[PDB]
Write a protein that binds this ligand. Structure first.
Ligand code: MG
Ligand code: MG
Ligand code: MG
Ligand code: MG
Ligand code: MG
Ligand code: MG
Ligand code: MG
Ligand code: MG
Ligand code: NA
Ligand code: NA
Ligand code: NA
Ligand code: NA
Ligand code: NA
Ligand code: NA
Ligand code: NA
Ligand code: NA
Lengths: 1011, 1011
C-alpha cells in the first residue's frame, strides 16, 4: 500500500501516547524510581541488513535471519556504521520536492532481534513493545506476522504484541525506510540520518491498567498554598471495587494523599467518564520548583482494589511551579524570568543522533556551569531522559513539535493545507501527551520554520484547550502571529531593523512597542555562534536587563554538528557537509556551536558565561555594590574574592561573604589600599566563588567576575641617557643599522624592515609589512559560494575591491642620523587597478638603548570597503614554548567580543594562542595588549595581536583544521585596529557600525626591543 | 485492510475538496449558468446486488456484471428498494458501541455501471468521478482496477479516473458499506439508511486548471463601497502567458473586472504562491444580499492566456453582504437579525434521504410563505443545490458539519480524543472548502450533540483563521463554550431555568446577562413540534422582540420523518420507528415536523406563521399603527385589509396600501363606523395581503393578520315567554321530561342524561358525562414506555392518580318542577382507591322553549395532578356533513396555541375537525367558542370543543392513524377548560403554570337546544 507515501497514514495499530510508564507492581519501587521488572530494555546486539529499496527486501527475512546480515548495536544510525552516507543540507530537502512522494531509491534498513519472553508475561496482562525513535518510518513484524506501522522520528511508537508472542524465543523484524511522507515535516537544519536511533523496550501492563495520568499544580496569590490535581484514566475491567490512590512524597516523608473510586464529575447530558478519577491534594507551603532551586516531590499513582490489592503503580517527579503571562511578562512563580537559553540538537560526533545519559549529563553540567538556565529542544521532542535530567538539575525547557517544512515554497505550503493537518496534529498532540507532567517543560512550541498556516492556529488552540498551564510559542510567519503567546523571533537585532517583506525582523526594542503589541519577547534563536562569532553578545544582554518585556533568548546553538572521519593512518578528524560525498550540501553551516562536538569549549562560551552572570556589580569610590538577579534563592553558596594589581603585579586581595537576597543588593566597602609609587594602571578584579560543591559544580566554581580601572599613575620618568649611538651604513639597496650586538636591515626597494639580528642570530623569515586583511571568518563569508557569489558579504566586498591582491608601491624611503638615534622614514601606497586603497606612513627610530620605536599612520580611501584590520605582520625565525602578555585574556577576544576577557599578566603555551575552529579562519586575537613577550622579543604599545604557526594565507586557503601544517617559525600579526567579528547572524553582514574601521585615518605606535 | 474500521483512514486517493465546478469552456455559458458539456450526470439505471458482508462479495463482480443483480435507479437508498430495513433510533447507536469496530454482518451494496466517454476525454485532460453522497463508506473500482476509498456520507468524494479509462465500454464497481468507523460520527436522530443517495457525475477538467477559488466582499462604513476579493488557485504547469480574469456581472452588464498573471504577494522567507493570484475589484454602491431582497451578481473566473485564449472558466453567484457580531449583536449589513428559523432534514416519505429539486423548491416556498427567513442544515452538509436555491430565493443558512456522537458516554468521548481529530477535521474542513462562496451561508456549525471536546476548540479556530467572514456556532457541552460565537441552546425555555448539572439550560432572558456574558443568543433548536405541539410559541416571540440580544431561533423541525408502507390492499400508510422490524427503535420520535412527510401542514404551522409576522400592529381609538420589522425592504408589495364584524356578521370593511420603510411606522385612521344597537361584540380583523406574485408566493398571499375587540353591547333583553310547560315523569330508575315532540331522560342510578328524543329518534349513543382526561399528546407522554416508566410525565401522573380509571359515584340526583321549567340537580364524586379526585355539581334547567341550560361546578382535589380538561362528552347518534361555529378558527387551536386563530363564524366539513396526526391523540380542539352547530343541535356558552368520529378511548388505544375506524355517530367533547399542550420540549413536562388547570374550583355553563 506504500503507506510511506501517504500523509493520511501516519501509523497502523499504534497504541495511544502517554506519560512515561514502568508498571511497577510494588509502590515503594515506584516511589524510589528504582528499576521495574515489568520494563525491559531490548537495546544491545541486533541483526541488520541494508537494501536500496523496500522492493529489494526478500520475503524470507520475515521468517528467517539473513545470512548476509551483520550484528550491530541498537540504538544506532546506520550511516554511523558506514552503510550509506549521512547528508548535511540546511534548507533544501534531501529529496525531490514532490509531496507526498519519495525517491524509488529509498535506503531500507532491515533490523531483527531474537529475544526471550518469560511465560509469566504471556499468562496474564498485556505485553507491548516501545520504539522511542525510528527514523523515518517503519513496518514491524513479530514471529513472521505483521504488527503495524509508524511515522514521526522523534516520539515513541508502541504496539501490543500480546497476541504475537510465544514463551521463550521470539523474533522481531523491523523494516525502516529512510524517506517517507514524514520526511516533508522533518526538514531541520541537521545531518539527515536514519535507523533505530533511540531505545527499544518491552513493557508489561495488567489488563486493568493506568492508561494516562495528568498532574497539575495550582496556587494561591503568594504561593503559600497549593492544590495538586491528578487526573487518572484506566483501561480494561471497570468495577466498583477499583480505586486510585495518589500520594505525594518529599524524600521519605508523605506530605499528602487522596483515595477515590472511579467516576468523574458529570460533564454533559450523557454523564461523565466512568473510567476516570480526579484526585485533589492540599499542600501547605510547597517547596517551589525553579531552575535556581529544582525542588521536586514524588507523586505515586496506585491503581488498586478498595480492600488493598495493588494492581500497578506509576509515578513521576512533581515540581510545584506556575507559568503564566501577565501584563506582557512571562512569570514563573509570580516573578519575571530572564531566559539565559541555548538551542541544543541531539548530536554526537561518533554516534550521530543517538543520545546517552553520559553525554546528556555532560551537556547539562557545562550549560549550568556557564550560566545557562534554559534549553530549547531544537527542533523535535528529545530522548525521554532529557526531561528527567532537566527536572532534577533545573533547566527551563521549550518542548518543540517535530514539524519543520523549511524547504517548501512558500514555507507554509503544507502547514496551510488541511490535508496535512492530520500528520501535523499527531506530532503536536503526542508530544503533549508524553511530556505534559515534566516541570522542566514551561513552554510548548509548534515546530520550526514552517511558515504560518491555518494548521498552526488550530493546533495552538488545541494545546491551550488541553493544557492551560503553559504558554505556546511559534516563530513561523513573522514571529508575532496569532499562533504564538510570545514574540519569538530568530536573529532579530538589538537596535537595527531588518524590514524584510511580509516577515520583517524588527529591532527587538522596537518590536515590543509596535501599535497594539503587548506580548513578551524571547528570541527563539539569536547570536549565531558559527566559528569565530558572538560579536555583539553584550548588546543583547544590556537590552534584556534594561527592558522588562525583553526576557532573553536561546543562543544558536550548543554543540557543533561535526562528525568523525578517519584518514589513511587511522587518525580522526572533524568532518562537515560534503565530506561524505553528500551533494547538494551546506558545508560548514552544520557547525554553529558554543562547544566543539567533543564538548571542548569555543572561546565564545566564556563571553556567554560572563554576560549571563546572575550577579551585577557597580563601583563607587571604595564601595562595591552587588545586585542579585536570582528570583528565588539567597546567595547561600557564594563568596566575593577581590584583587588589586598594578600592571599584573598583585598588590592586595581579600574575600568577603556574599549575603544577598533575591533581587537584593549588598554594599561591600574595600579596605584602605596603599597608593603605589610605581607607574602604571591599578586594576580591581572581583570574582564570585562557590565554596561548596553542588549537583552541577565543583567546590571553588567561579560563577561571575568583573573588572574596573582604579587609579592610574602615568610614567613621567625619562629613560637613562644612552652611552652608545647606532651606526648607519648605506648602499643602493639597503639601510643597515648597528648598535652593540644588534643589527637592523631595511630594504630600499621594498621599503620594509627585511632582517634583524640579535648577536649573530637572524630574527625574521619574512619582512615586517603592513597587513589590511584577515583570513575570512564564517561571518565574513555568509552564503557566499564559488558557484553562487553573494556580493554583499564582507569577503566579497574585500575581494572585489582588491584588498587581498593589492601590491605595495614604495613612495618614500629615507634615513637620517640623529644625535642619539637613526631615523628611517617610509611611505607606501596600496593600489588595485589604478585605485589607491591605503597609504601607510611610518617612522622607525632606533636609539642608543637598542629599542626600535615604530610609528604608523594609515589613510584608508573613504570609498573602499572598511578593512578587516590595520596592522603589521612578519614571520619570526624562532619557535618558543610560551607567550607572555599584559592585556586582555587569557582566551581569544575580539573588539566586539572582549567583555569576558580580563586585563592581567597572562602566560600560555604557544598552542593555546591558536583556536582550532574546524573551518580555519582568523583566530586567537587578544585585544587591549600593552606588552607582548615571545622568545627574546618584547613589543610594547596598545595593540591587538595573534601569534601562531599558521599564516593568514594558509588559514585562508585551507578548508579543514586537520589539513593545516605548522610553518617555519612563528607568524605574528600585530594590529593597531581590528574589525569586529559580528554574529547576529552568519549569512549577512552583522558587524555593527561602531566596530567597523571607518575612521579614514589611523594611528598606532609600537616599541620593539629585546627583553 | 478493513479501512472501514480505522478512523485514521477516512479516504484513499480522494481529490481535494473545492467549490462547485463545471469546467465551462465558454465564458458566456459560465456567466448564464447554462449546462457544461464537460460535466455529465451518471444518474439513472445502475446494476445492484445486496450482500450481508463485504466478505460475501464475489471477486468476479469486479470484472463483470453479476447475473443475480437487479437494475435500480441511482441515486437511491437501498432500504427504500426493500433490500434491508431502515432503522429509526434516536440516541442509542444502531451498532454495538465498540470504536472503531463495526458488526461483522455489515450490509454491503454492490453498485455497477457500464459507460463510455467522449473520444477527446481519452485524448487529453483530467476526468474525475464525483459521488455527491455515499452512505456510509465505499471502495471504487474502474475496469476491474482499484481506484480509491471514501468516508463522510454528506460531502462529495472525487477520484481521478484519467489513467483508468479505455476506448469503448468502461465499468464502474462501487462497494458501499452500511457501517464504518464513520458511523460513530453520524449518530443523528434520523432514519439510518445507506447507499449511493446523491448524484454521481463525471467532470472533465484541463490539466492546467482552476483548482480552487474564494470570493470575499468587504465594505466601507455605510456599505456604499465594496471590494470584491477573489483568490484563485491553479494546478498544472505554470507558464508566463497564463492569466486569470475575474469579472462581476449585474444581469447582462459587466460592472467590474480584474486581470493578473499568477504569482501572489510574498508571504514568508521562501516567497509566495506562484500558483495563486488574488484579484481585487472595486464595486460602487453594491446591491446588497439579504433574505428580504436576495440581490445577486455573477462572478466569472477565467483561466486564459494573455493574448485571449480561454483555457477554462468557473463561476458562482455572489451576494454582497457582511455578517459580523458587534457589541453582542449578530449583524447583517449593519442591522441586527431576527432569525425566523427552522431545522430541516433531507427527508422524503418515498425516496428516503434522496433529495430532488422539486421537493427542495416546495420546502423553500412553504417556508417563505409561512414567514421563515432561515434554515439550519440539521445536521450535515446538504445536497449542493440547496445552497443555490437559498442564495436565489433568500434564506439565511447555518451550514453544519456531519459530526454527531450523541450515543457516546460521555457525549464528548470521541471529540475530546486527539486520535479522532483527523476524522473530525475533514468533516469540518471539506464542508468549508465546498460551501464558502455561497452568500446564503451566514454561520458555520461544528456539528451537533457531540459534547464539548478539545477537537471542537481546534476546529473552531481553524474556521476563524480560514474564513473570518462568518460566525462559528456549536451547541454541545452547554451551548456557551469557547467553541461558539453565539449562545445557541436547544430547548432552553423563555422564563423557566432547567439547572441540569454541567450543562444547564437557563431561561434565555437570564442566560444573556450571566456575569461576563456578552454574546447574542439564537436557539439552534426550540419549540419541539412533535404531534399536537407548539404550545407557548408566542412566549418565545414576545421575548425575541423585547430583548435586542435574543435574536430568534430554529424550530425543531420542518418535516415529519415518516416513511410510506403498504397494507394488504396496496393502500399506503405513514410508518415510524419499529414499523420495519427495526429494534431497538424510538417509535414516533422521528416525527417532529411542522408539516407531514408529504408537506401537508400541521395546525402548528399557522401559529408559527402568525408569530413570525414582519408587521406589528397596535390599536389606539380608531387609529391602527403598523410597524415594519423589515431591516432593508420597503413595503412595496403590501395592502392592508380591515373588516369589522358583529358576532361574525360583517358590518364594514376597506383597504389601504402599506407604505412603510424598514423599521418605520404608518398610521391608518379607520372611518366612522355605524354603531349597531343589536347586542354583541364588535371585532376588528386586519390582514396584510400581497397583491403581486413573487418568486415564492402567489398573488393575494396573506402575510400577516391581527384581531381586536372593539365596542361590546351586552344583551339586556329577556327571551320570549314560554307557551308551554315541560312535564316530569318519575320512576326509581329515571327522571323523564317531555315538551312537545322532545324528551329528555336522566338516569337516577348513574346521574347522567342518558337519552334525548326528537319524535321517535334517539339522539345519543352514549350518555352525557363529565370528562377530565384526554388521549395523551406526544407532549403528555415524553420518554415514557412500557419497558421504562417515567413517573414525571403528565400521562404517568394521570395514570398513577387513577384519572383514566376513576368511577363516578352518585351523591345526589333530584328533580323539581318550577313555574315554567323542570330542574334536575346532580352531584358526583370521582374516586380512585378511596381517594376523591373530582366533584361535579350540576343543574339542568329545561324550560318551555325546549332549551336545556346546563350549569357545572367542579371541585378538583389540590393534591391530585391537574387534570387535562374539565368538560362533558357524549356520542351523538347523528352524523352530519358540516360543523358550524362562532369562535376561534378555522384551524385546530389550544389555550397555549391559539394566537393565530381568529374569532369569526366558521363552517367546515366534519373531516376538517379532525387532525390526522400519524400518532393519534387528542386533536382538533377549537377554543373561545360561543356557539356550535351540528345537524339539529346548537350549543351556546363560552367553551372549547372537538367533534369527530373517534372516541378519546380509540385515539388513546391506537398507535397509527391508518388503524382508526369511524365509530357509530359523532363524538362530542365540550370543555369549560382545557390544559395547555406545551412543547418547549417533548420529553419532560412543558406546559407552563398559567395553562395548567390548578384553580381547584371551576365553573361553566352551556345551553343545548334544537335549531
Ligand atoms: Mg504515510
Ligand atoms: Mg499505602
Ligand atoms: Mg498464573
Ligand atoms: Mg530550517
Ligand atoms: Mg567588564
Ligand atoms: Mg476508516
Ligand atoms: Mg441527537
Ligand atoms: Mg392576536
Ligand atoms: Na528584561
Ligand atoms: Na546551521
Ligand atoms: Na554566601
Ligand atoms: Na579557511
Ligand atoms: Na431581539
Ligand atoms: Na426526533
Ligand atoms: Na405597498
Ligand atoms: Na394513541
Amino acid at each position: 500500500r506504500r503507506d510511506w507515501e501517504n500523509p493520511g497514514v501516519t501509523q497502523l495499530n499504534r497504541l495511544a501516547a502517554h506519560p512515561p510508564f514502568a508498571s511497577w507492581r510494588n509502590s515503594e519501587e515506584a516511589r524510589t524510581d528504582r528499576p521495574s521488572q515489568q520494563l525491559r530494555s531490548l537495546n544491545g546486539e541486533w541483526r541488520f541488513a541494508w537494501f536500496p529499496a523496500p522492493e529489494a527486501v526478500p520475503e524470507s527475512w520475515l521468517e528467517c535471519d539473513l545470512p548476509e546480515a551483520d550484528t550491530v548495536v541498537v540504538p544506532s544510525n546506520w550511516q554511523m556504521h558506514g552503510y550509506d552516507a549521512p547528508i548535511y543540507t540546511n534548507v533544501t530537502y534531501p529529496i525531490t520536492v514532490n509531496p507526498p512522494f519519495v525517491p524509488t531509491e529509498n535506503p531500507t534498513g532491515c533490523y531483527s532481534l531474537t529475544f526471550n519472553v518469560d511465560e509469566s508475561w504471556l499468562q496474564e496482562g498485556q505485553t507491548r513493545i516501545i520504539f522511542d525513535g525510528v527514523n523515518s518510518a517503519f513496518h514491524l513484524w513479530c514471529n513472521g506476522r505483521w504488527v503495524g506501522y509508524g511515522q514521526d522520528s522523534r516520539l515513541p511508537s508502541e504496539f501490543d504484541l500480546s497476541a504475537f508472542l510465544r514463551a521463550g524465543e521470539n523474533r522481531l523484524a523491523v523494516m525502516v525506510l529512510r524517506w517517507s511522507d514524514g520526511s516533508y515535516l522533518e526538514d531541520q537544519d541537521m545531518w539527515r540520518m536514519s535507523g533505530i536511533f533511540r531505545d527499544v523496550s518491552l513493557l508489561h501492563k495488567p489488563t486493568t491498567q493506568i492508561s494516562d495520568f495528568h498532574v497539575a499544580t495550582r496556587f494561591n496569590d503568594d504561593f503559600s498554598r497549593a492544590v495538586l490535581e491528578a487526573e487518572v484514566q484506566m483501561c480494561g475491567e471497570l468495577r466498583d471495587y477499583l480505586r486510585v490512590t495518589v500520594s505525594l512524597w518529599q524524600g521519605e516523608t508523605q506530605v499528602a494523599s487522596g483515595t477515590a473510586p472511579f467516576g468523574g464529575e458529570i460533564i454533559d447530558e450523557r454523564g461523565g467518564y466512568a473510567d476516570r478519577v480526579t484526585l485533589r491534594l492540599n499542600v501547605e507551603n510547597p517547596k517551589l520548583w525553579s531552575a535556581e532551586i529544582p525542588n521536586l516531590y514524588r507523586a505515586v499513582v496506585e491503581l488498586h482494589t478498595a480492600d488493598g490489592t495493588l494492581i500497578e503503580a506509576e509515578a513521576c517527579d512533581v515540581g510545584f511551579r506556575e507559568v503564566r503571562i501577565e501584563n506582557g511578562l512571562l512569570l514563573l512563580n509570580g516573578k519575571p524570568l530572564l531566559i539565559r537559553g541555548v538551542n541544543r540538537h541531539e548530536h554526537h560526533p561518533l554516534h550521530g543522533q543517538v543520545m546517552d545519559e553520559q553525554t546528556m549529563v555532560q551537556d547539562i553540567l557545562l550549560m549550568k556551569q556557564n550560566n545557562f538556565n534554559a534549553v530549547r529542544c531544537s527542533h523535535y521532542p528529545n530522548h525521554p531522559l532529557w526531561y528527567t535530567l532537566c527536572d532534577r538539575y533545573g533547566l527551563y525547557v521549550v518542548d518543540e513539535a517535530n514539524i519543520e517544512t523549511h524547504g517548501m515554497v512558500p514555507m507554509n505550503r503544507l502547514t496551510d493545507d488541511p490535508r496535512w493537518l492530520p500528520a501535523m496534529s499527531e506530532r503536536v498532540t503526542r508530544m503533549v501527551q508524553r511530556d505534559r507532567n515534566h516541570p522542566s517543560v514551561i513552554i510548548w512550541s509548534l515546530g520550526n520554520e514552517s511558515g504560518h498556516g491555518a494548521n498552526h492556529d488550530a493546533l495552538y488552540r488545541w494545546i491551550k484547550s488541553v493544557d492551560p498551564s503553559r504558554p505556546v510559542q511559534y516563530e513561523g510567519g513573522g514571529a508575532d502571529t496569532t499562533a504564538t503567546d510570545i514574540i519569538c523571533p530568530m536573529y532579530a537585532r538589538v537596535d537595527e531593523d531588518q524590514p524584510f517583506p511580509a516577515v520583517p525582523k524588527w529591532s527587538i526594542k522596537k518590536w515590543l512597542s509596535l501599535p497594539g503589541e503587548t506580548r513578551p519577547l524571547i528570541l527563539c534563536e539569536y547570536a549565531h555562534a558559527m566559528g569565530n562569532s558572538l560579536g555583539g553578545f553584550a548588546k543583547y544582554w544590556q537590552a534584556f536587563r534594561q527592558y522588562p518585556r525583553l526576557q532573553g533568548g536561546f543562543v544558536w546553538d550548543w554543540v557543533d554538528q561535526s562528525l568523525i572521519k578517519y584518514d589513511e593512518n587511522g587518525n580522526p578528524w572533524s568532518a562537515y557537509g560534503g565530506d561524505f560525498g553528500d551533494t547538494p550540501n551546506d558545508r560548514q553551516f552544520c557547525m554553529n556551536g558554543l562547544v566543539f562536538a567533543d564538548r571542548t569549549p569555543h572561546p565564545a562560551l566564556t563571553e556567554a558565561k560572563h554576560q549571563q552572570q546572575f550577579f551585577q556589580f557597580r563601583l563607587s569610590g571604595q564601595t562595591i555594590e552587588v545586585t542579585s538577579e536570582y528570583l528565588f534563592r539567597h546567595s547561600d553558596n557564594e563568596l566575593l574574592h577581590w584583587m588589586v594589581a598594578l600592571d599584573g603585579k598583585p598588590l592586595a586581595s581579600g574575600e568577603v561573604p556574599l549575603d544577598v537576597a533575591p533581587q537584593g543588593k549588598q554594599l561591600i566597602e574595600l579596605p584602605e589600599l596603599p597608593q603605589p609609587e610605581s607607574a602604571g594602571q591599578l586594576w580591581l578584579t572581583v570574582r564570585v566563588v562557590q565554596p561548596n560543591a553542588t549537583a552541577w559544580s565543583e567546590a571553588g566554581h567561579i560563577s561571575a567576575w568583573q573588572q574596573w580601572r582604579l587609579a592610574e599613575n602615568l610614567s613621567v620618568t625619562l629613560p637613562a641617557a644612552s652611552h652608545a649611538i647606532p651606526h648607519l651604513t648605506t648602499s643602493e639597496m639597503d639601510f643597515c643599522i648597528e648598535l652593540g650586538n644588534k643589527r637592523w636591515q631595511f630594504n630600499r626597494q621594498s621599503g620594509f624592515l627585511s632582517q634583524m639580528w640579535i648577536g649573530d642570530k637572524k630574527q625574521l623569515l619574512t619582512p615586517l609589512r603592513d597587513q589590511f586583511t584577515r583570513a575570512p571568518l564564517d561571518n565574513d563569508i555568509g552564503v557566499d559560494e564559488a558557484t553562487r557569489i553573494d556580493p554583499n558579504a564582507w569577503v566579497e566586498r574585500w575581494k572585489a575591491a582588491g584588498h587581498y591582491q593589492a601590491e605595495a608601491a614604495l613612495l618614500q624611503c629615507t634615513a637620517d642620523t640623529l644625535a642619539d638615534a637613526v631615523l628611517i622614514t617610509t611611505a607606501h601606497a596600496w593600489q588595485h587597478q589604478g585605485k589607491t586603497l591605503f597609504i601607510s606612513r611610518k617612522t622607525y627610530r632606533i636609539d642608543g638603548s637598542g629599542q626600535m620605536a615604530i610609528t604608523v599612520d594609515v589613510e584608508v580611501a573613504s570609498d573602499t570597503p572598511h578593512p578587516a584590520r590595520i596592522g603589521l605582520n612578519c614571520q619570526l625565525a624562532q619557535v618558543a614554548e610560551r607567550v607572555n602578555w599584559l592585556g586582555l585574556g587569557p582566551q581569544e577576544n575580539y573588539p566586539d567580543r572582549l567583555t569576558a576577557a580580563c586585563f592581567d599578566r597572562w602566560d600560555l603555551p604557544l598552542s593555546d594562542m591558536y583556536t582550532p575552529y574546524v573551518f580555519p579562519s582568523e583566530n586567537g586575537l587578544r585585544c587591549g595588549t600593552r606588552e607582548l613577550n615571545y622568545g627574546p622579543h618584547q613589543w610594547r604599545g596598545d595593540f591587538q595581536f595573534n601569534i601562531s604557526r599558521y599564516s593568514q594565507q594558509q588559514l585562508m586557503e585551507t578548508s579543514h583544521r586537520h589539513l593545516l601544517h605548522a610553518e617555519e617559525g612563528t607568524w605574528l600579526n600585530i594590529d593597531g585596529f581590528h574589525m569586529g567579528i559580528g554574529g547576529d547572524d552568519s549569512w549577512s553582514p552583522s558587524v555593527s557600525a561602531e566596530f567597523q574601521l571607518s575612521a579614514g585615518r589611523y594611528h598606532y605606535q609600537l616599541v620593539w626591543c629585546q627583553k
